[PDB]
Write a protein that binds this ligand. Structure first.
Ligand code: NA
Ligand code: NA
Ligand code: NA
Lengths: 391, 393
């Protein structure tokens, strides 16, 4: 038997963290050890609250620290991962942060087992192949169409054949202003590229306002319209999706369990589900969504925006879904995110990347990142250390 | 005009904490100060992760510590509470723990403004009256059926006309074991009382395992079956509710935002929505649920298993809804929960309790509880304290 005998949590940060909407400025890295075998993962989460979730004194039987369900658990194959995740689901049910902390640990378990068994995580997850995905750069709409045009042109020059434009002025004013923006993105990208549009919930619950953009989206060959409405506005999503446009509705990036994804799929009638492994509980729950998406003719996309460790994890749950051909890619992250791995995922001759055809998550975490970016962190309860920065 | 000058967080705990599913064993209390005016609230949440959510270094612009959206904020009236809560919602969006930390802060704001204005929080929430609620004794299943019977018998003899048992061994093994427990509850309670059963999400997503208890629940004349499944498993809830049993489905205590409660009402086919102000973000979101429940003709009930400060807060959102007459009452809380308030909510001559007529949440937090149960807690980043246990007195 192998048993988990250490979980080390590394709070990493860039020296200055700004108010930019940039989640690559810090990270919580997780190193799991079981009988000398090592696995790494990354939480898509506030690092200190997640650490607190891992080590806190229990409040009661269903508000236990995450560590209670992890340390000392048998880890021999995939089925143990499911058991550990279910245990955290029950015993930490009232610890709100738990899913985010779980996510980094859980992916580390797949990494650990893959490297112990010389199998890629995607193979352990049940896929027989890892197929090429076209990476998309997540871009901001310019304040003017002219700026969007140039941004799209610059992305294409940089080698992207797929881009998503989001936020900025989009949906904040007239249908005509949105038409200029979306056409500018298409014009700059070129006619053969994949173009997606994220409106960051700007239409609220106003189905007619969102629907007024569908002809423009279809004219520009836009594949998906992400987050047209408030996250809770499921009926609005379904109504918009029922309008018959070619562009499909996308959502899911903030789901922190399978149910939230399923709500969007079944009650929201979305056509692209977008899943962050660093949020949803890791690879197992993401793979659950991918299976459910397949059943429904819904396309799975990853959501990821930090390191290549997180990117590798993000690709595992749809590695074997050949037709789900687009993936999110961290096109311009902070140096921390680049530095976290020694090696990186590289495109093939067709510009496609894939969940590494290599053991576990298929990437080496760089000890040198650990040192440079390490945040000195300690928590004491009753005078006694319950968490200190590891090495 | 007033600005929030201080927010002090008190991690309280019983000397021992067990594996009972009992939220009264520890607490996170929140004292907000604005220009000498005080309000108190309570988070029904894991205290250390919540404190961490309050003080953590920011990760980026929409993952800030809760304190960034609270300290220094103007608090000139009820509208600022909504404003501050929305700010936390935006600035701490990617901080999953945030709503639990916010809950205690937000209710402390209602308490503070109510105390300053000599008005009960329910009046500030827009209710014209605080109506009597009929308390059901909220208890845990004993480890054996006879223990459960004795608990139900003791509740009836204390004057409770309604009892709920939750958790303990319920749903952990066979239907037969559950039947013994539920029948013993009915036996102890007698035939006339209302009996409710809470299974603490134990069936997970197993509709058939849950469905297998429906005859037993109906034979015992159980009013509702609470939390049969994972909080987000709405289709499972709806499937269970469609099996034709008389027992109705209840839930919502795990809602940490408004839409979790709305979705449960709209997709879960529940007959009772149950809201914890200490989890959902305080009185505002809870009142928003109560309005939505009213629009739907769904009975609203508080979820409360802890102190009378929590009780008072969770009664506020339905104080003015006269027909929503039942409330949860923690009948065997840990001493910590008892000691947290110096005064308590007491029944009138008719046996009814209510959101206090007194200002704010209408109860005083006891400084003696702060002293007895305080957990000494320190967080350092870069060698520097970012949190330490507040000074006493
Ligand atoms: Na997005
Ligand atoms: Na069973
Ligand atoms: Na309950």
């Amino acid at each position: 038997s192998l048993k988990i005998d250490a979980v080390d949590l590394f709070y990493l940060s860039m020296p200055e963290v700004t108010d930019a909407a940039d989640g690559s400025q810090d990270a919580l890295l997780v190193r799991v050890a079981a009988g000398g075998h090592i696995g790494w993962g990354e939480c898509e989460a506030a690092p200190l609250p997640s650490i607190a979730a891992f080590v806190c004194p229990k409040s009661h039987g269903v508000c236990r620290p995450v560590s209670d369900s992890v340390l000392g658990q048998r880890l021999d194959g995939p089925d143990d991962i499911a058991r550990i995740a279910a245990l955290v689901g029950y015993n930490s049910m009232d610890l709100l942060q738990a899913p985010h902390m779980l996510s980094g640990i859980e992916m580390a378990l797949w990494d650990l087992l893959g490297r112990r068994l010389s199998a890629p995580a995607w193979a352990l997850l049940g896929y027989s192949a890892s197929h090429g995905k076209r990476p998309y750069a997540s871009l901001l709409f310019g304040d003017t169409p002219q700026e969007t045009l140039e941004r799209a042109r610059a992305a294409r020059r940089d080698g992207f054949a797929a881009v998503k434009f989001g936020w900025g002025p989009i949906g904040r004013g007239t249908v005509a202003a949105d038409a200029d923006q979306i056409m500018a993105a298409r014009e700059g990208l070129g006619p053969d590229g994949d173009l997606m549009v994220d409106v960051g919930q700007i239409f609220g619950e106003d189905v007619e306002a969102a629907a007024a953009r569908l002809p423009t989206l279809d004219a520009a060959g836009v594949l998906w319209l992400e987050e047209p409405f408030d996250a809770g506005a499921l009926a609005a999503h379904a109504a918009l999706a029922g309008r018959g446009a070619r562009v499909r509705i996308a959502g899911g990036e903030a789901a922190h369990n399978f149910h939230m994804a399923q709500h969007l799929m079944d009650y929201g009638r979305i056509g692209f589900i977008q899943i962050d492994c660093g949020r949803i509980g890791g690879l197992g729950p993401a793979k659950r969504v991918a299976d459910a998406a397949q059943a429904r003719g819904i396309t799975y996309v990853n959501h990821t925006f930090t390191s290549h460790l997180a990117l590798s994890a993000s690709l595992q749950p749809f590695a074997g879904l050949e037709a789900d051909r687009i993936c999110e890619y961290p096109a311009a992250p902070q140096q921390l995110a680049l530095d976290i791995t020694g090696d990186h995922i590289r495109p093939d001759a067709e510009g496609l990347i894939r969940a590494p055809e290599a053991p576990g998550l298929g990437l080496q975490v760089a000890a040198s990142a650990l040192r440079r970016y390490l945040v000195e962190t300690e928590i004491r309860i009753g005078g006694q250390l319950i968490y200190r920065t590891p090495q």
